[PDB]
Amino acid sequence: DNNTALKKAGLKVTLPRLKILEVLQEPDNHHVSAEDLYKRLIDMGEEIGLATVYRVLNQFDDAGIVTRHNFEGGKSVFELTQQHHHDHLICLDCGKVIEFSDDSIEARQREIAAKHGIRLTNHSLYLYGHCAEGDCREDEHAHEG
Amino acid sequence: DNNTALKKAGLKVTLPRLKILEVLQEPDNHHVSAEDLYKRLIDMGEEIGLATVYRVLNQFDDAGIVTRHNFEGGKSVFELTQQHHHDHLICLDCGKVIEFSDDSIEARQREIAAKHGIRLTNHSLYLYGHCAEGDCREDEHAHEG
Ligand SMILES: [Zn+2]
Ligand SMILES: [Zn+2]
Ligand SMILES: [Zn+2]
Ligand SMILES: [Zn+2]
Ligand SMILES: [Zn+2]
Ligand SMILES: [Zn+2]
Ligand SMILES: [Zn+2]
Ligand SMILES: [Zn+2]
């Protein structure tokens, strides 16, 4: 299955490719920096250097497998292009990118475009803010509902 | 009044500056390309070249008077930074940038950030779509509610 999608993009089905795909399918890691991906890759105990993680993730974007984005101006973050629709809530103190989908917003967005003669075809919604209490740079649980 | 705000930014209060400010305060032109601003400037019959409109609008951004944005990837569009909060609905066939504000969305946005430990401090919401009926490149009335 992962084997099939890799070929559909144009990449030979190596193990480090299949292993990075599997980290990008974990729920905690739908939005992950190249390094945090390597941090996960070494917790699972894969001898896969950080330079190779960069190598592969860049190749994946070329083949439309993943989208990169600099939500923090600097820190690049990668996600599986093939995913259900969500928008992005980003914490400005610790860098955490949180996904979310609101059906009443996606609906009003269609309603607002249709009021002005427009059929909504794409949109981007980025939320930015600060940790409400304490310091999220310590509590890894700070941004989980 | 326009005189005061111009000084607050650091610019001498010339007439072409005050005249461009006045076009950027008209309701039709809250979001206007440099040229469409010159098109308005010549309807009012001001002998103000298009090159000077670029000159001034760039100076205004430096002094935080206006924000530029390339909503269409290419076409630059300018607006008065000092304005009530709105978001942006952009027509992909004709380039029209439409402003809008929804109180139920701005409220849910605060609710969604607060669910994940975040106090919402900034956000950007861009809507993109195509003209629903006919061809808006003809009907200037296509995107007015
Ligand atoms: Zn995402
Ligand atoms: Zn959305
Ligand atoms: Zn945080
Ligand atoms: Zn902060
Ligand atoms: Zn605007
Ligand atoms: Zn808004
Ligand atoms: Zn249009
Ligand atoms: Zn179209």
UniProtKB/Swiss-Prot annotation, chains A, B:
Alphabetized InterPro entries for the sequence: FUR (IPR002481), Fur_C (IPR043135), WH-like_DNA-bd_sf (IPR036388), WH_DNA-bd_sf (IPR036390)
Pfam families (UniProt xref): FUR
Residues annotated with N(tele)-UMP-histidine modification: 116
Mod. after translation: Can be UMPylated on His-116 by SelO/YdiU.
Activity regulation note: UMPylation of Fur by SelO/YdiU splits the Fur dimers into monomers. Fur loses its DNA binding activity and therefore its repressor activity, which induces the expression of genes involved in iron uptake.
Superkingdom classification of source: Bacteria
Key words of the record: Cytoplasm, DNA-binding, Iron, Metal-binding, Nucleotide-binding, Phosphoprotein, Repressor, Transcription, Transcription regulation, Zinc
Region of interest (DNA-binding), residue spans: 1-82
Record flagged with keyword ATP-binding: no
Biological role stated in the UniProt entry: Acts as a global negative controlling element, employing Fe(2+) as a cofactor to bind the operator of the repressed genes. Regulates the expression of several outer-membrane proteins including the iron transport operon.
Record's protein name: Ferric uptake regulation protein
Species annotation: Escherichia coli (strain K12)
